Structure formats: C-alpha cells, structure tokens
Design a protein around this nucleic acid. Structure first.
Ligand SMILES: [Mg+2]
Ligand SMILES: [Mg+2]
Ligand SMILES: [Mg+2]
Ligand SMILES: [Mg+2]
Ligand SMILES: [Mg+2]
Ligand SMILES: [Mg+2]
Ligand SMILES: [Mg+2]
Ligand SMILES: [Mg+2]
Ligand SMILES: [Mg+2]
Ligand SMILES: [Mg+2]
Ligand SMILES: [Mg+2]
Ligand SMILES: [Mg+2]
Ligand SMILES: [Mg+2]
Ligand SMILES: [Mg+2]
Ligand SMILES: [Mg+2]
Ligand SMILES: [Mg+2]
Ligand SMILES: [Mg+2]
Ligand SMILES: [Mg+2]
Ligand SMILES: [Mg+2]
Ligand SMILES: [Mg+2]
Ligand SMILES: [Mg+2]
Ligand SMILES: [Mg+2]
Ligand SMILES: [Mg+2]
Ligand SMILES: [Mg+2]
Ligand SMILES: [Mg+2]
Ligand SMILES: [Mg+2]
Ligand SMILES: [Mg+2]
Ligand SMILES: [Mg+2]
Ligand SMILES: [Mg+2]
Ligand SMILES: [Mg+2]
Ligand SMILES: [Mg+2]
Ligand SMILES: [Mg+2]
Ligand SMILES: [Mg+2]
Ligand SMILES: [Mg+2]
Ligand SMILES: [Mg+2]
Ligand SMILES: [Mg+2]
Ligand SMILES: [Mg+2]
Ligand SMILES: [Mg+2]
Ligand SMILES: [Mg+2]
Ligand SMILES: [Mg+2]
Ligand SMILES: [Mg+2]
Ligand SMILES: [Mg+2]
Ligand SMILES: [Mg+2]
Ligand SMILES: [Mg+2]
Ligand SMILES: [Mg+2]
Ligand SMILES: [Mg+2]
Ligand SMILES: [Mg+2]
Ligand SMILES: [Mg+2]
Ligand SMILES: [Mg+2]
Ligand SMILES: [Mg+2]
Ligand SMILES: [Mg+2]
Ligand SMILES: [Mg+2]
Ligand SMILES: [Mg+2]
Ligand SMILES: [Mg+2]
Ligand SMILES: [Mg+2]
Ligand SMILES: [Mg+2]
Ligand SMILES: [Mg+2]
Ligand SMILES: [Mg+2]
Ligand SMILES: [Mg+2]
Ligand SMILES: [Mg+2]
Ligand SMILES: [Mg+2]
Ligand SMILES: [Mg+2]
Ligand SMILES: [Mg+2]
Ligand SMILES: [Mg+2]
Ligand SMILES: [Mg+2]
Ligand SMILES: [Mg+2]
Ligand SMILES: [Mg+2]
Ligand SMILES: [Mg+2]
Ligand SMILES: [Mg+2]
Ligand SMILES: [Mg+2]
Ligand SMILES: [Mg+2]
Ligand SMILES: [Mg+2]
Ligand SMILES: [Mg+2]
Ligand SMILES: [Mg+2]
Ligand SMILES: [Mg+2]
Ligand SMILES: [Mg+2]
Ligand SMILES: [Mg+2]
Ligand SMILES: [Mg+2]
Ligand SMILES: [Mg+2]
Ligand SMILES: [Mg+2]
Ligand SMILES: [Mg+2]
Ligand SMILES: [Zn+2]
Lengths: 99, 99, 208, 83
RNA sequence: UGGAGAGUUUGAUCCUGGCUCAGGGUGAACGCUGGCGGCGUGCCUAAGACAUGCAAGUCGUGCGGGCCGCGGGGUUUUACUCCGUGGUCAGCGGCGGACGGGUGAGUAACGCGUGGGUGACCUACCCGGAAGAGGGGGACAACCCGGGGAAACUCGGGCUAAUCCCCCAUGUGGACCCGCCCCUUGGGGUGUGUCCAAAGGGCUUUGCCCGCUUCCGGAUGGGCCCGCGUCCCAUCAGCUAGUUGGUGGGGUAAUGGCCCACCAAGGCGACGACGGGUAGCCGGUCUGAGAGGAUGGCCGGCCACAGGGGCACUGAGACACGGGCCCCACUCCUACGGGAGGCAGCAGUUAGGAAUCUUCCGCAAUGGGCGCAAGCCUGACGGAGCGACGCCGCUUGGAGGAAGAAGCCCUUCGGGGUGUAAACUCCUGAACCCGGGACGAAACCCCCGAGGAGGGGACUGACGGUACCGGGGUAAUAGCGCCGGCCAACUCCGUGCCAGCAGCCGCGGUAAUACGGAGGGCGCGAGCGUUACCCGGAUUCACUGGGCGUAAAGGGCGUGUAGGCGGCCUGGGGCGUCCCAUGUGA
C-alpha cells in the first residue's frame, strides 16, 4: 500500500512553512515600511524599507516568491514609499532610493 | 500582423471607450451571392477624441477590459451620421417586436 | 474456392462450349456435344428472352466461371480495373490473365486451369527461383515461370510437355518447351485475346 | 528536453523506425518536430537507412541529446566524422 | 474518367405524388453453418459497484545511522578498530511522480479547427556565450529513552550529517525607485541610490570528469489574446448588478471586472441575444457523378474528467486518476474513542445489456524515469492468447469415365432430369512425422587515440525449436439465401381465406411456379441470411437541380420600415473579384 510518495508530501509540509515564513516577513516589514513612511520619519521609513527590499530578493533565491514577482513587490513597495515620504517630507537618508 | 478594421463609431457614451460597427462581406458557402453581416467592437480611446459618426481604423490590441481588445487607429472621415442613422433605425424596429 | 461440384454443367447454362475440362472438352463431350441445352428438369423447353438483367448477368457468370475464381476476388479486380487508367474492359481481362494459375494454362503446363491451380498451389511451379504457390500471384512482365527441380520429371507434367511440342501459343508469351519454362513478354492486348465474352456487358452489370 | 530517437512504424513483426526529433515527453508513435530519416532493423532493402546529416547537424547544434540506439545510426551513418 | 431504375392511384391514359425495393456502409448483434492461416479489431449499455496481482520510481559519485557477510595489517597480541567492503531497509537530501496509460461525464465555449497577436508572458533537464565559487553559524528525521493507542498511528525528551536552512563578503551581472536618450503599449542602453549569488562529490593528482551560482542567448513545451468556421426549437423575444465602461488598488508568469473600493450609465439582441434540448472537437471515416449528406470507433492532435463537489500545499510545471484537506454517497475494520478505501491503468469480477477477450509472456526490441556507469522499475510498449467481428491469402482435389449406373423426382408411358455427377483407374499431396532453424541486435559497455572523431574487440531474443528451409506422407470440412412480379432461377404433391407468407403490389376460399415438403434450378460460398442505423436511389428541400390557373402551394387589398436588387458616360481608389509569387496547410 505504502507508495513512498509520502516523502514528497512530508517534504512539502516542511517547505510550506519555510516560505510561508519568509513571505509573511515580506508583508509585515513591508507594512511597517509604508507605515513609518507616511507618518513622516523618512530615514527610519527607508531603514525598514531596506531589510524590506533585502528580504524580498532573498526569498527569490529559492522556490518561494520568484520570477519578476520578486520585483513587482519592489516596483510597488518602494514606489509607494517614495510617494509618501514625498508628502511634504524629503529624501532624508540615502535610502534604497536614488534621488 | 495585428488585424485591423474600418467601422463607424456608434456610441461614445462610454468613459474612454467607443462602439465601432464593422460590416464585412463574403459569399454564402452554398448560395454564393455575396452576403453582408456585421459586428460591434469595443475600442479604446484614452483621449476621448473620436466622436460619434467617425469612421475609424481599429487595431487588435492588448486587452483593456472585458470587451476591449482593439484601439482606435485613425480617423477616415468626420460627418457620416447617415450610417449611424441606419444602425439606430435597425435598433429601433426591435422595440416593436416583443409582446 | 472453385465449385468443386459438377462442372461440365455450366457449359450447359451459358450455352457456350467451355474448357474447364481438358482432353474431354475437346473430345465429343464438354458435357455439351451430346447435351447442348441447360441443366435441370426444364431447359430443354423453349427458353425466354433474358431481361436486360439476365443478359448482363449471364455474361458475367460466363467470364467469371471461365477462370473458376472467387467472386469477391473477381469483383475486386473489376474495381481495381477502374482504379487505373486506360480502358477498364480490357485491363480487367488483361489483369485476369496475369494470374499465375492462368499462366500455367496459357503456357499449358496443364490441361485445365483447375488442374493448373493444383500444380501451382502444390509448389510444382516457380518464378525466378522461388517456389510460388499463390494462385493469385500477379505475373508482371518478364519472369521465368519455370518448373521446379523436384518437379521437372513429373508424370502429369511430361504428358502435357510431350503434348506441348510445337503448337504456337500466346503472342504475349514464349515457351522454352525443352527447359520447361516460359516468359511473360508483355500484358495481353485485347486483340491478342479471344474469349466467348463481351467485356462491355460485364462492366454494365457491375453498375447494377 | 528535446530528443532524437526512433519512432516505430509499419505492421507487427515488421518494424520500421523513423529517427525523429520530438520532445522527450511526446509518446512514441507521436507527433514530432521533424523527420530526419527512416531506418530498418531488418534491412529487407538496400536502403536500410538514410539521414539528413545536414539538419541532424542542426538539432545537435541547438542541443538535443538523441537516444543511444540512435547514435548507433548517426555514427554508423557519418555525422561526427570531420577528419 | 463520372450520373441506369423498378413495382404500386385507373376499365385504360398522361401527369402530380407518396409509399416500396435492388447498392454500398458498421466497434455490430441475432439465426443455420463453420477447416487454415496472416494483418487488423473487440463494454456502443451503468462516468454502475469492484475481490486478488501487478501498473513509478530511482541515486552509496548529496548525508548520517539500524542491520549484515568477508578481510587484514598496526601493538609478539590482548582491548580491537578503521577502512576497503558488498549487500541491504528506512531516514534525511536530489530528480521523476504534471510523462506515459484510461474515459467522453460535462462542455454550444476561444472547447475545437484555422490563421494571426504578446511593447502583456513563463519554460525543469538540453545546447551555446560571459562571470564567479571567500568565511562563519544552525535545525530536523534516522537513532536513544519515556508516554498514549485495538488498530491507524502518535506526543514528548536528547544527540547528529549533508549538495538541507541561515548569515556577512566579492557583483560578471541581474531586480527596483527616480532621471536621460533611443524606441514606441511594459522593447533597448546608461547614470546615481539600494538589493540579491553559490554545494560539494568523485577518481587514474599535478589534471580531467559529475555538479553549484548570477546573467544573456538558443531550442522545446506552454499561459493569455483576437478575425474567421463550429447543432435543433422563435410554440424561447427580449436579456443583463460585476451587469458595460472609467479611475485607483489587489492578484498572476502575464493581459483582463479575474477579484475589491469609488464613480459613470451603460453592455447585448430577428445578422437570433436569453432560455430549452442535444453533443467532446479535429485530421479523418462512410456514402454520393458531384455539390451534398451522415459521422468522429480504432489511429494522431486538442479538450475535459478520475464516485459527486470544494479546495489549496509542494513545484519550472498541477489545484495533480494510483498526492493532501473538507462535505456527501458507498464498502470494509474497530477494543465504539476511532480508522481504511477509490480500475474511466493492465487482467479479472459482478451489474445491466442484443453484445465485447487472457487474472498470459518479456524488458530482447523501441520509448521513458533515475543514475558516472554497471543497472533498477517501466501492464507504455514488444508479443502470445480467445470471438469468421472485419480485410486478405488457402484448403476440402487434378486428369480421364456411359447415349449416361442404382436411387429419387417428372412422364403424352417412347422418354426426360440429376449427370461425368458418382462408381473405377491413374497423377498431385492440406493435415500429419523427421531434420535444420533465424532476421528483428548493435549499441551502452572493452584496448589505440584523448573517455572526442576514427577502427577494432565481446555479451544480450520474450515471440520460439514458431517463421522459413529440406525429407517422408494420408483424397482430405459445405453451407446458407432465394426461385410470382421488381429479381437470376419450374414442376410435383399436400393444404383449401385453414395452415401460413410479406419489402411493396399481394398470395392461399380444389386444380397454388406466392403456403409447406420434393426434384430440379439460380446466387454465393467458410460463409450465407435476418434485424438495427447512416448515405444512395430521392431532381422526395432542388446551390448544383424543383415548384404554385385547376394536382400541395400567391399573402383578401394597400401603404411603407429594414433588407435585397438597380439605367447611360468620364475619371480617382482598388473593397469584392482575378493572377503571380511566398509562409501555412504536421
Ligand atoms: Mg479505368
Ligand atoms: Mg485519359
Ligand atoms: Mg463508378
Ligand atoms: Mg394497387
Ligand atoms: Mg504472428
Ligand atoms: Mg466505456
Ligand atoms: Mg556502500
Ligand atoms: Mg552501503
Ligand atoms: Mg554525482
Ligand atoms: Mg549504509
Ligand atoms: Mg568488550
Ligand atoms: Mg565506532
Ligand atoms: Mg493504447
Ligand atoms: Mg476508448
Ligand atoms: Mg445550450
Ligand atoms: Mg468560439
Ligand atoms: Mg466565435
Ligand atoms: Mg491556435
Ligand atoms: Mg496556423
Ligand atoms: Mg568576459
Ligand atoms: Mg553543524
Ligand atoms: Mg557542520
Ligand atoms: Mg547577504
Ligand atoms: Mg558594473
Ligand atoms: Mg550583496
Ligand atoms: Mg550579500
Ligand atoms: Mg558559499
Ligand atoms: Mg542550497
Ligand atoms: Mg557554506
Ligand atoms: Mg590529489
Ligand atoms: Mg466579471
Ligand atoms: Mg455610487
Ligand atoms: Mg455529452
Ligand atoms: Mg452525452
Ligand atoms: Mg464536402
Ligand atoms: Mg456528430
Ligand atoms: Mg460533427
Ligand atoms: Mg472506445
Ligand atoms: Mg481513441
Ligand atoms: Mg480518439
Ligand atoms: Mg472528483
Ligand atoms: Mg467507477
Ligand atoms: Mg474530488
Ligand atoms: Mg498525481
Ligand atoms: Mg486530488
Ligand atoms: Mg487507480
Ligand atoms: Mg468486532
Ligand atoms: Mg467483527
Ligand atoms: Mg479502547
Ligand atoms: Mg467512520
Ligand atoms: Mg522472466
Ligand atoms: Mg527496455
Ligand atoms: Mg511485467
Ligand atoms: Mg458465431
Ligand atoms: Mg455470425
Ligand atoms: Mg439414373
Ligand atoms: Mg431413368
Ligand atoms: Mg472429376
Ligand atoms: Mg472425382
Ligand atoms: Mg484406388
Ligand atoms: Mg513438402
Ligand atoms: Mg540441434
Ligand atoms: Mg575504460
Ligand atoms: Mg526441428
Ligand atoms: Mg534439435
Ligand atoms: Mg503465427
Ligand atoms: Mg513437406
Ligand atoms: Mg424470371
Ligand atoms: Mg391445414
Ligand atoms: Mg396445388
Ligand atoms: Mg394462378
Ligand atoms: Mg411453389
Ligand atoms: Mg416469393
Ligand atoms: Mg438526396
Ligand atoms: Mg437531395
Ligand atoms: Mg432553384
Ligand atoms: Mg415538384
Ligand atoms: Mg390575389
Ligand atoms: Mg473606377
Ligand atoms: Mg491606380
Ligand atoms: Mg492532405
Ligand atoms: Zn466440358
């Protein structure tokens, strides 16, 4: 009966978590980014937008988030960040953005 | 080559969208006599330039919406309401058919 | 295969002298010389004008019976005839002739075709070295329709050989009576043929 | 990946492969990208092989591991001989 | 290079017009009969229910152990060990389980076919080109202990490896924000800012192979998109709330109302929307002179489904038939808490049905998967098996023998027919027995060179002691339909509108070529008939090719919408139309 395709299954479980994990970090850091972004604090906003950008591409090196979806995240993320710091603020610290 | 069509614009009531009607013609598979049929296409017009009664080149395009997969290429002649006359008349004899 | 039953009997329905028998049919008795009428209780009474059917029918049954051959096979050939170019009526016949068991008759290695079939089928014949026994075997032009080694000195083989001396046969053929072997010159012209049969009437019936 | 192999054909007991470039997946007697020449295990005729070495050169060129018993008819058919 | 008609309305006639037959066709079935092979083919019904076996795994050159067999030096040896080591069965780890194989339920729709689009896209392994591989840390199974449990399994506690996880560096390069040029839908280059690499494993060591990482190209496979083609009912005529479009966002590999918030009031429809019925589509197949009609079994392509329905996880790829979770139905186990299962894979069961096979053989071939290879599994496949289901080849004999046996039919009592038919003689020699016996198989693998090109060297065949070849060798299965007309093929008896026949016209009420039996004949033969359905005949939906005074058929008459159709001459474009080339039409 026991077709050891189970190994394939047990594997997937271990997998699921591992990138579920990476993925949620994306989100929460991503939020805590746009958050501090709008609020005003820029050098802090970006400083988080940093380990943001990082954690994204990092998830890219494997089976998790991949392709240019690794990018689409950034293309919008920092895209939103800039726009908000833009609200009366200014490119305080040399964040992940070029002025 | 991205297929292209001339048909008259037949409605402008849409936001950045236009209804274009295009008679093709062809010969009946058994009866030869060239017959005429027509279809409406939902063109895109981000400049809201084209008005009613315009005759237009329409190009197969990247999908804009549920029904728009063409965009307006170029005008061919302004004043030709006489044709929309027809499309309206046709569309009005209907109301006198129901029960 | 061939209606093994009474055969000096068909000659009688068609009413034409037919050479299914060998010596005897040449004698006074193809069944026919003594009894020129059709078989059965009747047939000796005044027959009636065959409908356009009977005619096209009986003519078919003639040319078919002459080769003692499978209707399905015949029917097939008739159609193969239309498959290819030319005058169908001829090639049909021309094609009938290509039949190996028909050659061992035109080349006379036997008195009958039914006899001819036996020998062919029994491996007694051969072609270019191989012991063909397929009556069907279509003879293409130009091939040693010889006789086999174990066979050459055979009882009923010789009695037909010593009887096969001289007597010219087949303009579309050639017989090395000594070496016991013939050749297929070419495909039998219509004129080269002479059968008691109207080809044009057999085509008719094969349209129903 | 893409492949180059024998595609059986012709009746029972009468094999008659067809040496072709398919995708590895395609079933055996399947659809295929192109024909690069027949073959016969029995050699009933003097023509018991053939290969458009020209285009074969091509498919190997754009990368395309063939079968093993298909090399056996590319070598023994002269494709890798440059001298 | 291809086209036939007949019977039947009448006392008879011509015409109109139905009905009916002869033809071909099948995944066939049923009847009577049935010898041999070859290549095909075989659940059309309940996408009903399935016992048992087998259908997908593989790598010790990713890692660490449980187990087990062999061996030895080193220390005189003891304690032995480590390694070489081969085998294992599990575990982690990698690649494959999405291919292959089954079936048409659903689906009338970009599902399919066909031709294009993607500046809106991905693509494992393969191929090509560039670059790079420095250091450090950690977890969890196996295993050990403990615990619960009928079972299924499972909780905890403690170690440990790695091509598993993670971190900092180098950044060829790539991703992103913004800015510039080129380009023109999101294409290409550059600049500043940030972000992201990596894994070791082998042998014959001064080296090569299997691998890793980033990136660009290549090929192949695929997502998406559009023009056009794709069934019956108008006694279905109006349809539409994500409905149509916009703006911004979410999602994806990517476009899109695919999903959400906000706004606008749209979108569709007699050129048939909406509904209802029906159905997988195609290359093709059948039929037909052809136009046309019918059709999608087998084979190949595409689609869809895996008891019904929903779902996502892993992944380059699936929402995955032999993976997972949930509900419903169904079967089984249970220690009543619980648990297991999915043949529309091969084969086989049962059920229903007019009806559809062997629980075979083999990886030798071809193909696939993994692997450095040796090799392992491959019910794909290659074969064998059973059914005249189909097409094709073959057989049941060949020659000679009577004015012509016996029997049996008919008979004007002379005779006729079966009938060369048999008998008999001769010749041949299916079956059967003996011998020999493959092709399908030369590659991976071994030396030269260099593991390359090039040559040479060996193993391996399920089918099968079959095919085929030589020797011996026995005359050695015939059946079914019809015989009134169409329609080939006549008489005798019985029967007496009874028994029965039939496709239609009709036949049988004493003298039947129409019923049944006979002799005889006709047709065709391992087949012959019946029934069913498709095309033809049917020019009987008529484009090819029909009609409407009385045969069926002119709207009771106008007036007009849409639609269809449109005079004479010059000219522009060239939409149809035509011609040429070119891609495509697997
Ligand atoms: Mg012809
Ligand atoms: Mg000609
Ligand atoms: Mg014809
Ligand atoms: Mg009548
Ligand atoms: Mg065989
Ligand atoms: Mg079925
Ligand atoms: Mg080992
Ligand atoms: Mg070991
Ligand atoms: Mg390795
Ligand atoms: Mg071990
Ligand atoms: Mg001890
Ligand atoms: Mg130890
Ligand atoms: Mg199959
Ligand atoms: Mg099927
Ligand atoms: Mg429908
Ligand atoms: Mg469609
Ligand atoms: Mg369509
Ligand atoms: Mg397409
Ligand atoms: Mg195309
Ligand atoms: Mg360089
Ligand atoms: Mg460690
Ligand atoms: Mg370590
Ligand atoms: Mg880092
Ligand atoms: Mg640089
Ligand atoms: Mg870095
Ligand atoms: Mg780094
Ligand atoms: Mg590293
Ligand atoms: Mg790694
Ligand atoms: Mg490391
Ligand atoms: Mg070394
Ligand atoms: Mg919607
Ligand atoms: Mg509102
Ligand atoms: Mg259906
Ligand atoms: Mg159905
Ligand atoms: Mg047609
Ligand atoms: Mg159909
Ligand atoms: Mg169809
Ligand atoms: Mg089927
Ligand atoms: Mg099929
Ligand atoms: Mg099919
Ligand atoms: Mg299901
Ligand atoms: Mg089932
Ligand atoms: Mg389900
Ligand atoms: Mg699966
Ligand atoms: Mg599933
Ligand atoms: Mg299964
Ligand atoms: Mg119990
Ligand atoms: Mg019990
Ligand atoms: Mg209990
Ligand atoms: Mg239960
Ligand atoms: Mg075995
Ligand atoms: Mg194999
Ligand atoms: Mg097996
Ligand atoms: Mg039977
Ligand atoms: Mg039968
Ligand atoms: Mg007698
Ligand atoms: Mg008598
Ligand atoms: Mg005789
Ligand atoms: Mg006899
Ligand atoms: Mg005797
Ligand atoms: Mg013999
Ligand atoms: Mg021997
Ligand atoms: Mg070596
Ligand atoms: Mg033997
Ligand atoms: Mg022997
Ligand atoms: Mg055989
Ligand atoms: Mg013999
Ligand atoms: Mg008659
Ligand atoms: Mg009676
Ligand atoms: Mg009577
Ligand atoms: Mg009478
Ligand atoms: Mg009678
Ligand atoms: Mg009758
Ligand atoms: Mg018709
Ligand atoms: Mg018609
Ligand atoms: Mg007409
Ligand atoms: Mg008429
Ligand atoms: Mg009138
Ligand atoms: Mg002009
Ligand atoms: Mg001009
Ligand atoms: Mg063609
Ligand atoms: Zn005679």
């Amino acid at each position: 009966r026991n077709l050891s395709a189970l190994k394939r299954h047990r594997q997937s479980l271990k997998r699921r978590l591992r990138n579920k994990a990476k993925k949620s970090a994306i989100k929460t850091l991503s939020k805590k980014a746009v958050q501090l972004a709008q609020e005003g604090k820029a050098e802090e906003a970006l400083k988080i937008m940093r380990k943001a950008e990082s954690l994204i591409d990092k998830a890219a090196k494997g089976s998790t988030l991949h392709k240019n979806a690794a990018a689409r995240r950034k293309s919008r993320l920092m895209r939103k960040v800039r726009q908000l710091l833009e609200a009366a603020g200014a490119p305080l610290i040399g964040g992940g953005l070029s002025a | 080559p991205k297929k292209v069509l001339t048909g008259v614009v037949v409605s402008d009531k849409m936001q950045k969208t236009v209804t274009v009607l295009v008679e093709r013609q062809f010969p009946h598979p058994l009866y030869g006599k060239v017959i005429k049929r027509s279809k409406k296409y939902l063109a895109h017009d981000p400049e809201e330039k084209y008005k009613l009664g315009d005759v237009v080149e329409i190009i197969e395009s990247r999908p804009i919406s549920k029904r728009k997969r063409f965009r307006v290429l170029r005008l061919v002649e302004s004043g030709r309401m006489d044709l929309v006359e027809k499309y309206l008349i046709r569309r009005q004899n209907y109301q006198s058919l129901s029960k | 295969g061939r209606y093994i039953g009474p055969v000096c009997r068909l000659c009688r329905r068609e009413g034409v002298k037919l050479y299914l028998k060998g010596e005897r049919c040449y004698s006074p008795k193809c069944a026919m010389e003594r009894r020129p009428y059709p078989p059965g209780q009747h047939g000796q009474k005044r027959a009636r004008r065959p409908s356009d059917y009977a005619v096209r029918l009986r003519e078919k049954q003639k040319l078919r019976r002459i080769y003692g051959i499978s209707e399905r096979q015949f029917r097939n050939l008739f159609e193969e005839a239309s498959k290819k170019k030319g005058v169908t009526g001829s090639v049909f016949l021309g094609l009938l002739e290509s039949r190996l068991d028909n050659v061992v008759y035109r080349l006379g290695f036997a008195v009958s075709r039914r006899q001819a079939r036996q020998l062919v089928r029994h491996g007694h014949i051969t072609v270019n070295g191989r012991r063909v026994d397929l009556p069907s075997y279509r003879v293409r032009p130009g091939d040693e329709i010889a006789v086999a080694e174990k066979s050459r000195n055979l009882e009923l083989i010789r009695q037909n050989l010593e009887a096969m001396k001289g007597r010219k046969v087949g303009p579309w053929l050639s017989l090395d009576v000594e070496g016991m072997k013939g050749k297929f010159l070419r495909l039998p012209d219509r004129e080269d043929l002479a059968l008691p049969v109207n080809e044009q009437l057999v085509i008719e019936f094969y349209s129903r | 990946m893409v492949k180059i192999r024998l595609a059986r054909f012709g009746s029972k007991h009468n094999p008659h492969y067809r040496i072709v470039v398919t995708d590895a997946r395609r079933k055996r007697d399947g659809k295929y990208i192109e024909k690069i020449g027949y073959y016969d295990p029995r050699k009933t005729t003097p023509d018991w092989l053939k290969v458009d070495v020209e285009r074969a050169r091509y498919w190997l060129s754009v990368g395309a591991q063939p079968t093993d018993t298909a090399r056996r008819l590319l070598r023994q058919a002269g494709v890798f001989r440059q001298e």
